[PDB]
Amino acid sequence: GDLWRQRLWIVDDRTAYRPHANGVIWIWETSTGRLFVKIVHRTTWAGQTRRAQLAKWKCAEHVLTMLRSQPTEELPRGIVLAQTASMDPLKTLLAGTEYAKIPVRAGAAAMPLQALMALPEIRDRTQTARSSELSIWSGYADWLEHVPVWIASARFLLLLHALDRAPERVLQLVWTPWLWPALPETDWRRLELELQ
């Protein structure tokens, strides 16, 4: 439970190709809760030949673009990739740039960040997309008002795993833009207890 230490970027592209639907690449900023949803349009895959070949490089290029759009004080202190196949491509695209010597690590697989595909607001903004749209959500809502950073981080992680093992039950228990509904802390506590 040490993702609250520094400003890390968890990158998950395991939903970049979804059969006959727009995919998504997720970037979770651990310290702040900021979530980068990059909708990958279906035209990406039209006429393609290897999904891994294309996906790994588009993910690497996307991370490079999100880096380029950040101020130097808001650059991540580490980058964690869910799939190791994009570890080499990412490094290649960062060579020779100011973002080299930002440690790039694997092992985010243990974290089912892609399970956010189950939130109806995201799913609905995703399918109706016409371009490969970028949107930014606040994954910690207003939790940093009432809990320390490590609690908000852990809560988000518990939500991720609950969405990955019982998405309907999570959706039924819960409910710029907030990813979660505006609830008091007591209901958040009861929810944490109920989510196994």
Structural domains for the chain: 1-141 (3.30.420.230), 142-196 (no CATH)
Method: X-ray
Q: How far is CA 150 from CA 29, 105, 128, 153, in A?
A: 13, 21, 35, 5
Q: Is 13 helix (H, G, I), strand (E, B) or coil?
A: strand
Paired residues of 187 in beta bridges: none
Q: What is the resolution of this structure in A?
A: 2.8
Burial of 69 (0-12, 13-18, 19+ CB in 10 A): exposed
* Phi, psi for 167 (deg, rounded to 5): -55, -40
Tokens of 91: 């490094």
